[PDB]
Structure 1
Amino acid sequence: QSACTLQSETHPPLTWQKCSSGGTCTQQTGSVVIDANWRWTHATNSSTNCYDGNTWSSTLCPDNETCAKNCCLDGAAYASTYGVTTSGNSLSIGFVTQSAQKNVGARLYLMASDTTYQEFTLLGNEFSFDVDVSQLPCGLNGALYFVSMDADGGVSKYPTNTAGAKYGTGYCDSQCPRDLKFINGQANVEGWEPSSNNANTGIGGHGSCCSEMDIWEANSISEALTPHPCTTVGQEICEGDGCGGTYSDNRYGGTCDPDGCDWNPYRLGNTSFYGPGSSFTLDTTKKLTVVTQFETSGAINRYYVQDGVTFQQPNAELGSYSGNELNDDYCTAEEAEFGGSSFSDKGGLTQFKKATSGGMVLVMSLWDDYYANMLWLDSTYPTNETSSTPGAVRGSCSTSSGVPAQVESQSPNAKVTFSNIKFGPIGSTGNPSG
């Protein structure tokens, strides 16, 4: 797709800290950009929509190539349309925002310039952020994560994408998402099926795969840390059900692991660690600091800070594994005890280290779940299981929770605030900010 300018595009500024092994940090000035799927897509020479509700214009978009030639992405009113605001080092994302239409959530990328994404090499380094999840009830996910996207949003590879990172193109993740309207400089109208339960979305014949590091998928009830490997590290198109992921009938596709080696302390048995109020180790009614470290072995370490008190990731005992480091032993114990082979099938932490050794783009989002009601995060899943099935219980939310229409109606002013992002060598991000 190309870019149009009927609506101006001004990326909300956002600062972050780059820290040094020598003990100092230096402020960096970036911004955020909303993913292309949230944008108005219209004809290049008129206001006629290329996509509206959950269907494509059959005349502008008779096939994927003609559609991209005829159509452009336009600018975003971040606050008034999308409920996205920033101030200094803080980003807030509202849940439901009512303007001329209803918008739900947002997916945002951290930029390096007005036209390029910021890339982070995670291996050897650590990433810290503050988060306020107090206004995230059951069924919501305020996510902070990394994906192996191209810094230009795909422009250099696909000529027919001229909108680029400035307009939030080029997304991929380990679901190989098929809900994307543009992939590889072409539309996704071919094979498009509108969602039965979402007036704004559908599933196309193509998806966009790449490695994904879920630092943080969480609400006020549960939180999870999850690396996802793919057989190809970076961005790659997939065909139909070969994509797997949430958007295919068979979740387990040909290239990516859509489940990951997840670490949710509640799921692992510590139901007192993270939750709302002073009866939890970390009180989710208040801001907390989350630090994630990528040691060169390929293992992942985690600690948290709240009220100046530090907590390592709680210890877990699972099969023959015991510890709090997310390593090969943890991931293979998890498969043995909870079931599944997706993570190891796609190459495990060894394959995942190939992603963290390269550049990845920072994503921050807020969503509800039109496929599984976020039950995998904060409830018992599958919902016919009990606490006696290992790993079935992931949080304390009712198995009835998280119906999108319901949570949108009841909790429209839910929000997540991410702040004070700091990045640098392991051991550096707790040092004084510059």
Structure 2
Amino acid sequence: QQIGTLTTETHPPLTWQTCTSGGSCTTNNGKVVLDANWRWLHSTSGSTNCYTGNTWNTTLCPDDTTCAQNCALDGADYEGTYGITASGNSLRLNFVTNGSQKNVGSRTYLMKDDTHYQTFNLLNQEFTFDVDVSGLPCGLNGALYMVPMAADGGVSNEPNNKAGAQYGVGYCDSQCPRDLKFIAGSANVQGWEPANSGLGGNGSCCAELDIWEANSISAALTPHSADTVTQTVCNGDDCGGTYSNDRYSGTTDPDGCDFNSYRQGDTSFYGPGKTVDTNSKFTVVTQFLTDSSGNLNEIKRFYVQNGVVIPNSQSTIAGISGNSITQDYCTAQKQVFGDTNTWEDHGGFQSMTNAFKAGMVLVMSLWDDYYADMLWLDSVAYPTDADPSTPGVARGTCSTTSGVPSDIESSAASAYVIYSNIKVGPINSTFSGT
């Protein structure tokens, strides 16, 4: 994709911190950038749209290459169009924004400068942030996560990609998404079928560390492995993931090794009025421990609320013990829940180690779920028809009829999430309390 010049692209500032082992932290002046899929995409010769609604202009985009040559991503009005505001240490994403047209959700990335994403290698480190999820009902997901996108957005080896990180280009994840307009320096118009989205012929695959997927009801922490940790391009249904007729037939792990406290048997721990009380802000700490060879072997979670350090809840499911993500936990959980262990298949902890070594980009998003209504995260039963008596079926308190986008984009139009006070450093460097 080309660089559009009709609207200035100014990345809202967002400060985040790097800490020493003793808890002394210094500030980094980062910026946030909106993902390319949300942008106006128009001809390089003026204001004519290359893409409108859920279809392409086939004169401008008769094929993937020509489309990338002809079409330019332009600047974004962050607050006015997309409901994205960044102030000091805080980033707020609004669910619905009624600008000139209705916008639903957003996906953003942390930048180190105006043409490069910040990358992270969190081995032997922790990532910590504050979050307010009180405004997120059933069916919403304020996600903060990491994927090994190219730091420059792909420009160095993609001749038809000039827009790059500056315009939020280069997304991939463990679902191998086919709804992306640009993948690996080409448009995705060939094979495009409308569902503001459709599915193109290609998907964009990589490993994915879901540090935080949550609303006020339920939260999940989920690493996803991949055969190749950085971006690869896939072919239609062979992509696997959510947009395929054969979910597990691809090169990534679309399920991950998840820890959702509620799914792991503790329904008293996370939620409204609960131990981690989602009616108020709280701190989320995620630690990436290694074995003696420096390979990831454990992900731990702590919360801080009202100055109290709260260890992650123990899994209470018979056959699945502990309160952290380890090889023993993941093996046990997949066996006991009867879920295909695509996590281990595509390289598990070694895959995630390699993803960190490649360098992870931080993604902050807010979305609703057109495939499964977020029921996998927060439903009394997922699948909806499954028995909550069966281990792994229940994930939250939301009804099986909750989270339908057409419903919640109305009833929860005022929803929002605020991420703040991002801190990174050695183990136990970023938090304290009683």
TM-score range, shorter chain: over 0.9
Question: Tell me, what secondary structure is at the counterpart of 1:81?
Answer: helix
**Residue identity matched to 1:158:** E
> Following the alignment from structure 1 to structure 2, what is the Cα–Cα distance between the partners of residues 183 and 358?
19
Question: Tell me, what secondary structure is at the counterpart of 2:389?
Answer: coil
Query: 8 Å contact 2:265–2:317 — kept in the other structure?
Result: no
CA shift, 1:394, in A, is 0.4
User: Which position in structure 2 is the counterpart of 1:392?
Assistant: 393
User: Which position in structure 1 is the counterpart of 2:336?
Assistant: 337
CA shift, 1:427, in A, is 1.4
Deviation sequence 1:14-50 (CA, Å, 0-9, x none): 0000012254211010010000000000000011100
Query: 8 Å contact 1:179–1:201 — kept in the other structure?
Result: yes
User: Which position in structure 1 is the counterpart of 2:306?
Assistant: 307
CA shift, 1:319, in A, is 4.7
Query: 8 Å contact 2:23–2:431 — kept in the other structure?
Result: no
- Please say which of residues 319-328 and 134-143 is displaced more in the overlay: 319-328
> Following the alignment from structure 1 to structure 2, what is the Cα–Cα distance between the partners of residues 157 and 245?
26
User: Which position in structure 2 is the counterpart of 1:208?
Assistant: 204
Query: 8 Å contact 2:320–2:332 — kept in the other structure?
Result: yes
1:356 matched to 2:350: no
Q: 1:295 aligns with which of 289, 297, 309?
A: 289
User: Which position in structure 2 is the counterpart of 1:250?
Assistant: 246
Superposed, which structure 2 residues align to 1:67-146 within 5 Å? 67-146=67-146
Query: 8 Å contact 2:14–2:32 — kept in the other structure?
Result: yes
Query: 8 Å contact 2:129–2:285 — kept in the other structure?
Result: yes
1:416 matched to 2:417: yes
- Please say which of residues 170-179 and 345-354 is displaced more in the overlay: 345-354
1:285 matched to 2:242: no
Question: Tell me, what secondary structure is at the counterpart of 1:324?
Answer: coil
Query: 8 Å contact 1:24–1:431 — kept in the other structure?
Result: no
CA shift, 1:431, in A, is 6.8
**Residue identity matched to 1:206:** N
Deviation sequence 1:117-173 (CA, Å, 0-9, x none): 000101111000000000000000000000011100011121110001000000011
**Residue identity matched to 1:308:** G
How many equivalent pairs are there? 426
Query: 8 Å contact 2:320–2:336 — kept in the other structure?
Result: no
Question: Tell me, what secondary structure is at the counterpart of 2:209?
Answer: strand
- Please say which of residues 234-243 and 80-89 is displaced more in the overlay: 234-243
**Residue identity matched to 2:398:** C
Deviation sequence 1:341-367 (CA, Å, 0-9, x none): 211221222222221233100000000
Query: 8 Å contact 2:93–2:365 — kept in the other structure?
Result: yes
Query: 8 Å contact 1:274–1:283 — kept in the other structure?
Result: yes
Deviation sequence 1:283-313 (CA, Å, 0-9, x none): 1010010000001132101100000111111
User: Which position in structure 2 is the counterpart of 1:29?
Assistant: 29
User: Which position in structure 1 is the counterpart of 2:225?
Assistant: 229
Query: 8 Å contact 1:319–1:333 — kept in the other structure?
Result: no
**Residue identity matched to 2:199:** I
> Following the alignment from structure 1 to structure 2, what is the Cα–Cα distance between the partners of residues 157 and 335?
39
Q: CA RMSD in A?
A: 1.2
> Following the alignment from structure 1 to structure 2, what is the Cα–Cα distance between the partners of residues 21 and 358?
24
Stretches of structure 2 that go unaligned for 5 or more consecutive residues are none
Query: 8 Å contact 2:178–2:201 — kept in the other structure?
Result: yes
User: Which position in structure 2 is the counterpart of 1:266?
Assistant: 262
Stretches of structure 1 that go unaligned for 5 or more consecutive residues are none
Deviation sequence 1:75-119 (CA, Å, 0-9, x none): 000000000001100000000101111100000000000111000
Question: Tell me, what secondary structure is at the counterpart of 1:322?
Answer: coil
Question: Tell me, what secondary structure is at the counterpart of 2:81?
Answer: coil
Superposed, which structure 2 residues align to 1:155-194 within 5 Å? 155-194=155-194
CA shift, 1:250, in A, is 1.8
> Following the alignment from structure 1 to structure 2, what is the Cα–Cα distance between the partners of residues 54 and 409?
21
CA shift, 1:254, in A, is 2.1
User: Which position in structure 2 is the counterpart of 1:8?
Assistant: 8
> Following the alignment from structure 2 to structure 1, what is the Cα–Cα distance between the partners of residues 309 and 30?
29
Question: Tell me, what secondary structure is at the counterpart of 1:350?
Answer: helix
Query: 8 Å contact 1:178–1:203 — kept in the other structure?
Result: yes
TM-score by length of 1: 0.96
User: Which position in structure 1 is the counterpart of 2:346?
Assistant: 346
Query: 8 Å contact 1:18–1:27 — kept in the other structure?
Result: yes
> Following the alignment from structure 1 to structure 2, what is the Cα–Cα distance between the partners of residues 23 and 224?
27
Question: Tell me, what secondary structure is at the counterpart of 2:157?
Answer: coil
Identity level (%): 64
User: Which position in structure 1 is the counterpart of 2:322?
Assistant: 323
CA shift, 1:426, in A, is 1.1
Question: Tell me, what secondary structure is at the counterpart of 2:78?
Answer: coil
**Residue identity matched to 1:177:** P
